[PDB]
């Protein structure tokens, strides 16, 4: 359902052989800053006439090897031709280069072979329906048929608004203009109305065989300079405001593709969210490619493809089609802001709530305070299932770790029925179906602390029944507690928790106020306590997060 | 206890009259990008010889008025002279410009008066112990005594490592060097060992009345070019790695001041945290001024002064000495990451946990989804008191709003005693002392849901007793619920909550699993429900957050 | 000397004539230092430009786009804000304009630097 299928880059700079799936809206990010920039340049060379005329240098070839040929192919999908207007744009120019047998697909390729004597390898653009017999894109002079289809707008991080406005002023009443024109000449008559015009001529005439020297603008009219005025960081957003209005009117007849590199540069965090809303929520930017290091620039992300360039020197690329389902729509904004910062990390530990974050932040601080520097990240997920977070992180090649409590949820409208919520979420990551809800018989005289302890006994009983299902969880880096985190914490530092709280049952007291008591616990936690919790088998997720 | 007291900027560019307190480590941020840049330039003009020799242009004067004089004064504190080594650095150069009566203070001023005929206003640097009779800083030629005290290192956002390395190579064995030197000459003898050297001379000699042409490096030795090699974004951190080692050895005899502008540019989020740890935790950067738009660059902030430039055109500056107390040290990293993003907002709503964030994000989405674009922010605080967050936001001129539940906490080691935790935190913001803990008599047969309902009756009773104390909370934008959020939510949409949950007591069912049930609630919440919750008097904090 | 100037800078003013020079750029340096009832009519007429320029579809649509993006966008025209004197570049009635730059230097330096020795 997207015109842009995938792009292939062969032997171009650090790209040995890289295949990346695509969509209308694409966002690229990762550690390799060189790979992200070369990715945008590889798209410009294929589609931007100004950057393509310069040809390939020796450095652009992969590993500076001129024998290997540079090849950049863009695969397109024309299946939605019946209801896509921009698809008909491409068809009208391609004409007979398509075949009816493969009418759904169309290829746009860039081939380059290097000449030693000419010290210069030219760029030959081919297209066609079949990848085997691509034909040269027809052209006459400095323009070809491809330049009539696609117009590439590259938004530099740093831009002067007055300079770009001078480019758009020309194309963007008459009886009124005539009065302004005659009045413009009225300026020059009053300016001359005098001692300098006559003395510079007497000096010029003796020097060289009328020197009036009027004033600019009045010669060419008021339209020559019409720079804007509002009523550094603020004017950057007005340049985007010009781009939206300009490109639609100027390039309505062709497909416009935006290449936005690092737009968060010299931009406030609040404006980054404003730009993110305009990129995804608004239909103003139909097709763009975005390179960003800013998590706040993805707060409003939806219906986009996320491309992650790996930190390795091989320049491996992992792409994910990020789409928020309608069921998650009521918590979409909360979910995106938490996941946006996790895309840039290397290992993400899925925790439930803030009480786990308060504990883990203190424990990690004593054991390994540089865990975020090396790519670790604590992502808290509350109320929702793990599938949306795991699918996005898995496709992007990000190591995901899950630590959740074994919980039971009472079904509404019926008493005595409890859903196996803790197991179902871990089973959902493995693709298995939700387990049947169970009914446990608790007497009416058993309430409060006595009631909770009996429910814990069912959790331990349920945990033992699915002993093999837990075995599959550990292979998938899923860590399901027997009862909950507080009981696993008691197993690691029971002597410390009893001394810290002086209460004979520290687990019961910790769960009274989970946030406050966890803060009270971490304040009195010893350094050996943090190492004991870290080294304990029940907390293997902390060892997997640091990556030892 | 800090050498840098405050700085005064008068009639310099957009700074009409601005007074900013300072410390050794300073971070500046805000909407006004022009004010932050002019703030760093105002410091360079006072202390950087290279930027000071160019003098003041007409544009540098405030509102382009040359009548008003530009004045930049830096107030210093020399009280810690007995134990501060860098203080003795300044004393050794100032010599007799200090008086013993005001020995604790020293002024460094920049005065500029404009000449119409000379079209140029020079920079006159004065210093002295008394602000009334400042004396010209002694100098001879292009250097003065102040250039011997302070060395300003300005770190540009974009820097080439090889170029800065060429500046530091000179100042950073012999029998080994002698073998490398003779071997270097061995290159040239083997290079000549020939057809080009004789033919270009035959052409040159006929053209003009020996043309051997050897090879660079071999003439000046191997030390001329020694560029580094490791075994774009990665090399930026190595440039900082050079700066730490270079500046300490090169400028050990003088006070080095770093001016770092927008270092998050072209830097990964993980490296920003690495740089933040080096700025605050490490003692490598004793004195610096930091301009940043990145919240991740303040994850490790501590013992620094936060300067916030207001969004207004008057360029108002609010400064806060941010310091984390020892009591908050066990949750310092968790607290900083939440507060770092709140410094850049304009209105911050302090909520307790994520269940409040899940609800507020959905409600705000329907009512005002652009609330973060206009400066709103939801900051969740769990387990800790509000004083640390409110003091930082209040000093920076950021509107702070607090919404918390009226809670009771059981004291450890004793039953029947409950602390008025909900009221104490709101009283702590007003400066009042903690209230005396109360004891409520609950029978042993009353447990579970019946026990919670009796405790709610005490909360309503406690709420009515302190009816006037709640009145002072509303003036301070403190919103204390009578019982909790769930009961206030029932008051706003009771009909909707009963229909959504089908349970006769939706408040009791919502509190069973606060996270999951809140997600279940917001999914079925109507648009009119969000407007009813927003318009209700119990949720006036949402109206104060958007700023209507 | 005091600051960036010394007594020698008050005696001698050095004019360095580069082989390649743009006349319009050097003229912008000398325009400031080189009647009133006439200037007042030119000034009011300069404001008469801006009133007739706005007299309209772009000023309202860019604001609707800006206001939704960020919490009036009229955008007039340069020169009319600072007056006619901001840009007054010359016009005669590459090699020829080089001699006119010397023609400016002779007249400029004598009036501007009459009080000091010009080299």
Residue numbers in the entry:
A (entry chain A), B (entry chain A): 0 to 171, 181 to 201, 206 to 221, 225 to 246, 259 to 575
C (entry chain A): 138 to 171, 181 to 201, 206 to 221, 225 to 246, 259 to 284
The article reads:
Gabija is one of the most prevalent anti-phage defence systems, occurring in more than 15% of all sequenced bacterial and archaeal genomes, but the molecular basis of how Gabija defends cells from viral infection remains poorly understood. Bacterial Gabija defence operons encode the proteins GajA and GajB, which together protect cells against diverse phages. Gabija protein A (GajA) is a DNA endonuclease that tetramerizes to form the core of the anti-phage defence complex. Two sets of Gabija protein B (GajB) dimers dock at opposite sides of the complex and create a 4:4 GajA–GajB assembly (hereafter, GajAB) that is essential for phage resistance in vivo.
To define the structural basis of Gabija anti-phage defence, we co-expressed Bacillus cereus VD045 GajA and GajB and determined a 3.0 Å X-ray crystal structure of the protein complex. The structure of the GajAB complex reveals an intricate 4:4 assembly with a tetrameric core of GajA subunits braced on either end by dimers of GajB. GajA is a class 2 OLD nuclease, with the Toprim domain containing a complete active site composed of DxD after β3T (D432 and D434), an invariant glutamate after β2T (E379) and an invariant glycine between α1T and β1T (G409). Comparisons with UvrD and Rep show that GajB protomers in the GajAB complex exhibit a partial rotation of the 2B domain relative to 2A–1A–1B, consistent with a partially active conformation that is poised to interact with phage DNA. GajA tetramers form through two highly conserved oligomerization interfaces. First, the GajA N-terminal ATPase domain contains an insertion between β7ABC and β8ABC that consists of four α-helices (α1–α4D) that zip up against a partnering GajA protomer to form a hydrophobic interface along the α2D helix. The GajA ATPase domain contains a second oligomerization interface in a loop between β6ABC and α6ABC, in which hydrogen-bond contacts between D135 and R139 interlock two GajA dimers to form the tetrameric core assembly. Major GajA–GajB contacts also occur in the GajB helicase 1B domain, in which GajA R97 in a loop between α4ABC and β5ABC forms hydrogen-bond contacts with Q150 in GajB α7 along with hydrophobic packing interactions centred at GajB V147. Notably, the GajAB structure shows that the GajB helicase 1A subdomain, which includes the DEXQD-box active site, is positioned adjacent to the GajA ATPase domain, suggesting that GajB ATP hydrolysis and DNA-unwinding activity might regulate the activation of the GajA ATPase domain.
